[PDB]
Amino acid sequence: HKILHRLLQ
Amino acid sequence: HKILHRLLQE
Amino acid sequence: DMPVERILEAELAVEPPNDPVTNICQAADKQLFTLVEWAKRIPHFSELPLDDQVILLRAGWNELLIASFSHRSIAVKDGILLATGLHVHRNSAHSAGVGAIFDRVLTELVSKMRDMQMDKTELGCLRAIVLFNPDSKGLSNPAEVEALREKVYASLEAYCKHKYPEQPGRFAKLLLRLPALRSIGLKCLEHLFFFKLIGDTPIDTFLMEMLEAPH
Amino acid sequence: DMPVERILEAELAVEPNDPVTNICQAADKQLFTLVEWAKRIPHFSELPLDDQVILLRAGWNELLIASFSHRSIAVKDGILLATGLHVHRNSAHSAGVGAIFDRVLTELVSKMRDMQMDKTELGCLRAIVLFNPDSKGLSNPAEVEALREKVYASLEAYCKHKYPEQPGRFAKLLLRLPALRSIGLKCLEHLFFFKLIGDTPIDTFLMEMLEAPH
Ligand SMILES: Cc1cc2c(cc1-c1cc3cc(C(=O)O)c(=O)oc3cc1O)C(C)(C)CCC2(C)C
Ligand SMILES: Cc1cc2c(cc1-c1cc3cc(C(=O)O)c(=O)oc3cc1O)C(C)(C)CCC2(C)C
DSSP states (O other), X not given: OHXXXXXXX | OHHHXXXXXX | OOOHHHHXXXXXHHXXXXXXXXXXXXXXXXXXXXXXXXXXXXXXXXXXXXXXXHHHHHHHHHHHHHHHHHHHGGGSSSEEEOTTSOEEEHHHHHHTTOHHHHHHHIIIIIHXXXXXTOOXXXXXXXXXXXXXXXXXXXXXXXXXXHHHHHHHHHHHHHHHHHHOTTOTTHHHHHHTTHHHHHHHHHHHHHHHXXXXXXXXXXXOHHHHHHTSOOO | OOOHHHHXXXXXXXXXXXXXHHHXXXXXXXXXXXXXXXXXXXXXXXSOHHHHHHHHHHHHHHHXXXXXXXXXXXXXXXXXXXXXXXEEHHHHHHTTOHHHHHHHIIXXXXXXXXXXXXXXXXXXXXXXXXXXTTXXXXXXXXXXXXXXXXXXXXXXXXXXXXXXXXXXXXXXXXXXHHHHHHHHHHHHHXXXXXXXXXXXXXOHHHHHHTSOOO
């Protein structure tokens, strides 16, 4: 979930 | 499908 | 035509030592016979070619039947009522190694049928929509099945608007349980394929036949 | 409130030999764009971050299979990847995934084509998927359910207004969601298998989507 978190802001 | 064909007979 | 009154009578017509799973699996086998009777009372099903009747039932049986026992279980707290009369509680499903799948039935199906109070006509239409699945492979004529589906869903929409005129969302909401029903049926099938494989769980003849590869 | 004009703009805002490794590269790429798309859907960005994560992790494959399928409507017997590559049916078959590929074709692309599903309609379908209240771990399921209800009420009203001759169209749109659900699952099983055999390259975001939760 690292990448997704970063993209979510 | 043996059993199902039989029951579908009518 | 496709009258909801006939679909409903279809429903009403067919209504009925401790691994909890082997009881669950006997019940499914038993209700596969009754599923055949139910199908035959849905309008126009019996007019379809016999091979098509077979295709539809072999693709839909699990969805069709998970829809029925779920709706029966609406008044059960945290459990399921099997067509045998046996109540199976979620603790016992957990204790037997299938708690996750059992809870999805509970949370995505039983309890949502309860909160909306899905009625028997509505169920029956849902199940007719499932039965008339035009994406089923090998159908001699997909269009005709699609057309039967279209008629089921137009009669449902009209039943809903007349009977629950205060709930303009109700129709959509009923149809929007079909994706959960789809995934729950597949996830259940994968369990069954696993039980057959390990072989420590009795599976009766019709259930077993439904688990065979196609011709 | 849930205006279809906003969902539509979301759609327009994000538009762009083992055939499988190309297919998998496209998926990883569009996972980034899916995040951008989701943020433009009304009220999504207002939900708790953890829920945003749950909805995307549960819906991504369905969300993105819907997108490339709709793009592929004018392709004969194939799909158009966001890379620009057209992948034909014969090449999917030749690579060992012909059966799953045909189900995308027959159950999704072709039905989108026959009904001429429009971009607002797609967007609404995909919003409906995104707001999936059955997704496990949601801090508040009711709220996501409510966002879903508003999407499908706006869609219904868009259909009745724009295609008033077609009283069934709305239902028909929603009745693609079961096929989408199963095609998504069956495609995930293939991906878990590619990962396992370890042949096919899988880029980082795709791979992250294939991790176990937490
Ligand atoms: C056969 C079957 C197995 C399972 C489950 C259900 C069934 C199952 C039971 C009935 C009962 C029925 C009944 O008592 O009315 C029925 O009509 O059809 C079924 C179909 C089925 O797949 C759940 C999902 C509840 C838990 C997990 C396992 C054990 C895989
Ligand atoms: C990643 C993936 C794999 C497969 C398929 C599709 C995908 C796949 C491709 C895209 C492309 C995309 C694109 O080019 O627009 C996309 O946005 O999301 C995807 C998600 C996916 O799961 C099909 C079902 C077409 C054939 C079988 C396999 C090879 C398993």
